[PDB]
Design a protein around this nucleic acid. Structure first.
Lengths: 41, 154, 48, 128, 138, 98, 180
RNA sequence: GUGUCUAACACAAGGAAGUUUAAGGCAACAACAGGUCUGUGAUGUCCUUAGAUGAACUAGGCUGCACGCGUGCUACACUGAUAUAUAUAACGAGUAAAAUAUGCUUGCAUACUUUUCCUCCGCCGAAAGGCGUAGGUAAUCUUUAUCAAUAUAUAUCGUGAUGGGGAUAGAUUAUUGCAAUUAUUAAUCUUGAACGAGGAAUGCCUAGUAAGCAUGAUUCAUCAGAUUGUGCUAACUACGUC
């Protein structure tokens, strides 16, 4: 809908909801934070 | 995920102790670092099998595939090119019609097989079918296996 | 005449010469309608 | 700024560069993948932050395959009929040329031409 | 020396070779670690907990696998390990310890003591399944 | 010596006969080796005109192969073979021994 | 003693309907160190009771079209779902799951009249309702099936009317009451 | 325990298994004016039988297409597609043309030698495919202590007919055959339709089943979306009632 742009608990769907973004953008935020499926615990 | 505690003893020196993907990527990266392997040229353009249609989308895939073949070599001693084509097989979507099995591209396999042989890691004998491993290559695989085994352990 | 060496006219049921329903499995060359008469004398027996 | 448009006024920009290019022509995606590689751009990047020069290079590669390592078996419009070879017509020119081919077939008379004129399937719809 | 058993679910057969040893567990040419699916990893780790380390530590286990897919093969391996552990304690150690061990294994489950009873039913003409039939129509 | 038949009882009868036959000249035999059964399977539709429910029946011609072998001179085994034969079974002699 | 995935203690009890406690995997021999053992669970009338409830939950998750035969994946979905529940509240997810199954079971149902409901059937229906609700939530939406299952379980455990299982149970009971 | 406490049944325990253990095969009496004379030198009668309704040979036709109803396949996505990696299966099945040398008038004649069904392996080919050879009468060689695909593991998309979907079409080089031109079949690149999980109706199914996922065999010179087998991945729900 409008949940997709480039510029401004661990799990990608929540991040995608919270900032209103794609799951690819969520994963990139997860990767920046860190600095199939995955273990967030 | 990467490492779990277990009670039993293990061999600790072979591919039969190793995470295949980690080993395959590491050796491929090592080989590219060394620069013994070449893509080469035309192989940047090609497709990997009609069951895919596409290609691996990674740019270092040939080295990865070469390394993956070398692991299959360590498992299966005297294998040849038709065995390789069959090994790398998948399903092919036939359009509206149902799936049937489809080989990987035989030239890339043949090229790797030849290249490894030129770089001395395998030897075709008059005996039996195809290429088996050279000792120097095996000892290197064991050394890389040892590096990984230490790296996880400590 | 003008001969054809392959496809339907190249073969027949050995017993009856008809070109239909021929068992070429194991090189029998008999149509199953003829074969089921003779399968016992040929040595086959059904069990399943 | 960030969602800049693409070839023949198409508004793509948050699409990946491959996905944008495919949304023109090349959506068997092998064509896009090789063009991306010939350009040497990152396929993960988003279309609207390419500069015009990158786009021009891509348009050049798509338009002219001749100076690139692209083999005849890969090519769009592979032999082109007459003794004078032409290759890789693509896009609206391909569509126009194909219309010209159907017209040429019709004038000559070929079964496919005739079926195109009737409005019948070449492979046939089979009874129903 | 050597004691021998096997396990058999569906097609799959896993033969277990239990020799006097030091705590090694193999599956053909490959270490026990290389089962791969996490669920089926636990399934073969299960008997290791049931007999603990110090009763494992004077025996080596080698297992030889033919037939079936992974879930069937792992259950065959698990059954072969169960029977294997018991056979070693019956041939070398003691009957009373074997009975004590078997009690533990029984308390966990029957499937590492007694194999599966399920086997395939043949296809019969008039449908894709064994029993399931092509649609009737009017 | 290899024995092939489609009849169980005839092959087994030959087995007892060859065991006796071997002991007559007190020969050194390796025990009879039963080779994997081959079945000639025909899965046959019932009905000559293909009527009613489709209905298939499965016919089997099951051939049994067995091998019993002997370390003995060439003449002795061929002569033993010629006394031991009956018409129904298929016999092959492969012995070059001494 | 026995802990699920080597993690979850799952020795704690829930009061429930008493009959429901008998049905759920309270027993030691119904407990396992990681899901899946697959005994023969059709054989006798009450035989289904003896099945591990996690084995039943994964089997329900494994249901429907594309999901069929993906038992390991159904195990991964529940394992992921348990992690999510643990994050959302620090409670033991298995205990929460039992609470959701206890909550979800219908007390009465409707017939051509209205009837009480078997405790084994109540568990079977509850798991079915929670998984079907999870699928409905999953299909063509942002939320992963593990998230949906966790979300449904927490809502059902809470006793929220936004739960698909609670809503369906309420409606089923309400129609049964409406007739009788 | 129940049962005339008879024939017998019910539950639990023991047990690899406890209903006749599960699955097949064989299938009465008496019918049907069911189907099959296009399976048959089984066959009555009738037509026809040499400008033959026989034999044989060349095309075209059986897939035609304003359109209607059966049976199947493929989809409608994120528990998914895409790309790598890891694992693996059971039942199988496999031996009179052509080519080359010599003599004659591009052709003919004669001589002589392989292929023939399965192809390992080694070269060349994006690919299809090609070339060179080796073993196979077959528990031996193809090839089966490994010949499948779903599985599963890590990566790429991120709900938008979207990268779902592959209808539809164009341009290729191959393959079988005298002949492929009603796209024969094959791959390569491009082309990117309907379809947002199906209304009234209605099919099959109770334990390794159901469902999904494959694959061998059958026809076959040429071809599986069919049928018939075979396996792996392994459900739900009563467990009965008229």
């Amino acid at each position: 809908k409008l949940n997709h742009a480039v510029f401004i608990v661990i799990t990608p769907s929540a991040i995608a909801e919270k900032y209103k973004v794609n799951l690819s953008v969520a994963r990139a935020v997860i990767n920046h934070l860190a600095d199939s499926q995955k273990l967030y615990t | 995920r990467l490492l779990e505690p277990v009670p039993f003893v293990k061999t600790n020196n072979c591919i039969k102790d190793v995470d295949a993907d980690l080993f395959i990527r590491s050796y491929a990266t090592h080989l590219k670092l060394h620069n013994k392997i070449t893509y080469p040229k035309w192989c940047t353009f090609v497709k990997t099998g009609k069951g895919r249609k596409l290609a691996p989308l990674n740019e270092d895939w040939y080295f990865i595939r070469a390394s993956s073949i070398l692991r299959r070599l360590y498992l299966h001693p005297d294998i040849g090119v038709g065995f390789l084509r069959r090994q790398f097989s998948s399903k092919q979507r036939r359009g509206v019609a149902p799936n049937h099995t489809s080989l990987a591209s035989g030239k890339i396999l043949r090229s790797i097989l030849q290249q490894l042989e030129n770089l001395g890691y395998v030897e075709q004998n008059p005996k039996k079918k195809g290429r088996r491993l050279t000792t120097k290559g095996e000892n290197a695989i064991n050394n890389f296996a040892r590096y990984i085994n230490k790296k996880v352990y400590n | 005449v003008h001969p054809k060496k392959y496809g339907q006219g190249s073969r027949q049921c050995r017993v009856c010469s008809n070109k239909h329903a021929i068992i070429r499995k194991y090189n029998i060359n008999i149509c199953r309608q003829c074969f089921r008469e003779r399968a016992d004398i040929i040595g086959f027996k059904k069990y399943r | 700024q960030h969602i800049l448009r693409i070839l023949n006024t198409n508004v793509d920009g948050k699409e990946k560069v491959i996905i944008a290019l495919t949304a023109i022509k090349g959506i068997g995606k092998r064509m896009a993948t090789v063009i991306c590689k010939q350009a040497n751009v990152d396929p993960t990047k988003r279309a609207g932050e390419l500069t015009t020069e990158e786009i021009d290079n891509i348009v050049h590669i798509m338009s002219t395959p001749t100076q690139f390592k692209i083999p005849d078996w890969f090519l769009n419009r592979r032999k082109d009929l007459k003794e004078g070879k032409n290759i890789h017509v693509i896009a609206n020119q391909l569509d126009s040329y194909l219309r010209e081919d159907l017209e040429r077939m019709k004038k000559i008379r070929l079964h496919r031409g005739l079926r195109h004129h009737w409005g019948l399937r070449v492979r046939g719809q089979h009874t129903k | 020396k050597r004691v021998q058993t096997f396990g058999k679910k569906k097609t799959a057969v896993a033969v277990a070779t239990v020799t006097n040893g030091k705590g090694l567990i193999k599956l053909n040419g490959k270490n026990l670690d290389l089962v791969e699916p996490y669920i089926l990893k636990t399934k073969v780790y299960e008997p290791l907990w049931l007999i603990g380390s110090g009763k494992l530590k004077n025996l080596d286990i080698r297992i030889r696998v033919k037939g079936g897919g992974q879930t069937s093969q792992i259950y065959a391996i698990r059954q072969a390990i169960g029977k294997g552990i018991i056979s070693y304690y019956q041939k070398y150690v003691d009957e009373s310890t074997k009975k004590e061990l078997k009690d533990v294994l029984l308390r966990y489950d029957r499937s590492l003591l007694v194999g599966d009873t399920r086997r395939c039913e043949p296809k019969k003409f008039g449908g894709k399944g064994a029993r399931a039939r092509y649609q009737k129509s009017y | 010596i290899a024995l092939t038949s489609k009849n169980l009882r005839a092959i087994e009868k030959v087995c007892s006969d060859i065991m006796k036959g071997a002991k007559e000249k007190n020969l050194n035999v390796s025990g009879p080796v039963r080779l994997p059964v081959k079945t000639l399977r025909i899965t046959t539709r019932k009905s000559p005109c293909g009527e009613g429910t489709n209905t298939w029946d499965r016919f089997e011609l099951r051939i049994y192969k067995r091998l019993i072998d002997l370390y003995s001179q060439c003449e002795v085994v061929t002569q033993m073979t010629s006394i031991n034969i009956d018409p129904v079974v298929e016999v092959e002699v492969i012995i070059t021994d001494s | 003693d026995i802990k699920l995935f080597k993690k979850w203690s799952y020795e704690e009890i829930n009061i429930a309907d008493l009959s429901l406690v008998d049905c759920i995997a309270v027993s030691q021999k119904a407990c396992v160190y990681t899901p899946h053992t697959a005994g023969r669970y059709q054989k006798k009338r009450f035989r289904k009771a003896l099945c591990p409830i996690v084995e039943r939950l994964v089997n329900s998750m494994m249901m429907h079209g594309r999901n069929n035969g993906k038992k390991l994946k159904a195990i991964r979905i529940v394992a992921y779902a348990f992690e999510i529940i643990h994050l959302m509240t620090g409670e033991n997810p298995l205990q929460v799951f039992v609470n959701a199954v206890q909550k979800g079971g219908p007390r009465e149902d409707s017939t051509r009249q209205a009837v009480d409901v078997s405790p084994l059937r109540r568990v079977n229906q509850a798991i079915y309702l929670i998984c079907t609700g999870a699928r409905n939530a999953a299909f063509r939406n942002i939320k992963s099936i593990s998230e949906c299952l966790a979300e449904e379980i927490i809502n059902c455990a809470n006793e929220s009317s936004s739960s698909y299982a609670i809503k369906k149970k309420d409606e089923i009971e309400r129609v049964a009451k409406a007739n009788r």
